[PDB]
């Protein structure tokens with residue numbers, strides 16, 4: 001049985017998701033490696049060790065490990081400073097590569113992509129890469145991310161020019177690569193999926209959450225970042241008379257994605273919205289279906305999203321999604337079949353969008369079931385795993 005190295009440096013697949021350096025990349029590599037181990041592969045998922053009180057090896061499912069390498073300091077470092085920790089990481093990979101001799105390495109970030117680019121000069125292997133965010137789309141915002149990183153753009157160009165395969169999660173991602181990065185390189189459209197056994201209409205959700213069933217609810221699920229546009233959602237909540245906003249997401253006050261940019265609470269006291277904005281905190285990923293099902297609308301008010309995964313998590317639970325028209329959100333959300341699409345930084349358009357589907361609840365209840373069908377059709381992980389597996393089989397078929 002052949003081995004597989006999955007490299008996700010700041011994304012620990014053994015980590016609970018919902019805070020800084022957590023989220024969709026973590027969920028992506030975790031369910032990918034666990035699905036591949038279910039289909040006859042040996043999977044080692046490589047991440048960075050951030051605490052000596054953490055385990056070195058985490059065995060999730062049979063023949064599926066998470067391996068925390070000692071890259072740099074054994075503390076938390078945000079990814080914008082992890083580049084200097086990368087060559088040591090390379091060395092800490094090589095010992096494992098000395099034992100197993102990985103024929104196939106699938107790197108999942110810029111930083112881990114640089115690690116795979118260093119390994120590509122020394123060893124012969126099938127190298128695949130998923131970006132999970134392009135810096136060239138990141139560094140175009142009138143808000144934050146004008147302070148660029150040309151090292152990131154150089155490496156994100158050098159990955160696409162040299163990797164054997166590049167997994168794009170949306171046709172917008174390939175369009176952004178071909179317009180803004182390079183024309184060379186091989187690419188493959190395999191979109192992100194969700195577990196329909198973990199996301200489903202619960203139909204008992206407000207009784208579990210102790211919420212009044214005749215009161216409207218607007219739902220945000222995601223991280224705390226200026227990228228996510230919670231400012232615009234809170235400003236649009238002031239144009240709606242009834243209804244609470246449940247902000248679900250974790251944060252750490254010692255950290256930047258946390259009480260340095262959980263200033264939304266200040267915006268809660270700006271707009272006099274303390275009676276009708278609830279900060280839920282971090283909810284477990286296997287329990288979010290109750291929050292998605294209890295709500296009348298999930299909002300993804302981002303300023304860019306390379307395949308917003310809470311959109312398909314919400315549509316899987318039968319809840320319509322109002323989202324920005326920026327990235328993979330306009331690949332997931334059909335603007336009149338499953339939800340609505342608004343411009344990013346205007347609260348008036350977002351507020352009129354919420355007004356349309358709070359005033360017509362049966363229309364929201366059929367937008368939600370259409371989102372359920374669309375997720376069952378195109379974004380079911382139980383089929384996307386088979387597509388990924390056949391991709392690995394044909395790439396491993398590159399033999400003598």
Ligand SMILES: O=P(O)(O)OC[C@H]1O[C@@](CO)(O[C@H]2O[C@H](CO)[C@@H](O)[C@H](O)[C@H]2O)[C@@H](O)[C@@H]1O
Pocket residue numbers: 021022023024025026028131132133134138169192227305306307308309
């Ligand atoms: O915002 P950045 O500094 O560019 O960091 C990228 C940010 O996005 C994460 C969340 O952990 O996930 C990305 O990839 C997943 C799946 O591919 C998407 O669902 C998600 O939309 C996308 O942001 C992660 O890479 C980083 O924190």
Ligand SMILES: O=c1ccn([C@@H]2O[C@H](COP(=O)(O)OP(=O)(O)O)[C@@H](O)[C@H]2O)c(=O)[nH]1
Pocket residue numbers: 017018019022023024025027221222223248249250281282283284285288307308309310311313
């Ligand atoms: O309390 C939370 C808050 C968020 N998430 C998950 O974190 C993931 C990240 O969502 P997304 O891809 O849309 O944004 P990202 O953070 O990955 O860029 C989603 O599956 C969310 O369900 C979670 O599990 N618990």
